[PDB]
Amino acid sequence: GDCHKFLGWCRGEPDPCCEHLSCSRKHGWCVWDWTV
Questions:
Q1: What DSSP letter does each residue of the chain carry, written as one string?
Q2: Neighbouring residues of 3: CB distance < 8 A, sequence distance ≥ 6
Q3: What is the per-residue burial (b if ≥16 Cβ within 10 Å, else e) of 3-23?
Q4: What CA–CA distance (Å, rounded) separates 27 from 1?
Q5: What are the backbone dihedrals phi and psi of residue 23, each rounded to the nearest 5 degrees, phi first?
Q6: How far is Cα 13 from Cα 3, in angstroms, rounded to an integer?
Q7: CA-CA distance, 33 to 36, in Å (whole number)?
Q8: How many other C-beta atoms can be found within 10 angstroms of the C-beta atom of residue 31?
Q9: For residue 34, how many other CB atoms are within 10 A of its CB?
Q10: CB contact at 8 A, 6 and 30
Q11: How far apart are CA 26 and CA 16, in angstroms?
Q12: Cα-atom radius of gyration of the chain, to the nearest Å?
């Protein structure tokens, strides 16, 4: 049950991003919070 870090697939995945990250649909992966 490893989480998905930055630039990691999320769409469809069982668990959400790792930490301080938001699943980005535009790119298709989680991105930095402070960044976005």
A1: -PPB-TT---TT-SS-BSSSEEEETTTTEEEETTT-
A2: 15, 16, 17, 18, 19
A3: ebeeebebeeeeeebeeebeb
A4: 23
A5: -55, 110
A6: 9
A7: 6
A8: 18
A9: 6
A10: yes
A11: 16
A12: 9
The C-alpha atoms of residue 8 and residue 33 are separated, in whole angstroms, by 14
Residue 21 corresponds to which amino acid?
A: L
φ/ψ of 33, rounded to 5, equals -70, -60
Place of tokens 């630039």: 7
Q: What token pair was written down for 20?
A: 């301080």
**Residue owning tokens 């930490």:** 19
The token duo for 35 is 């960044």
Residue keyed to tokens 């668990």: 15
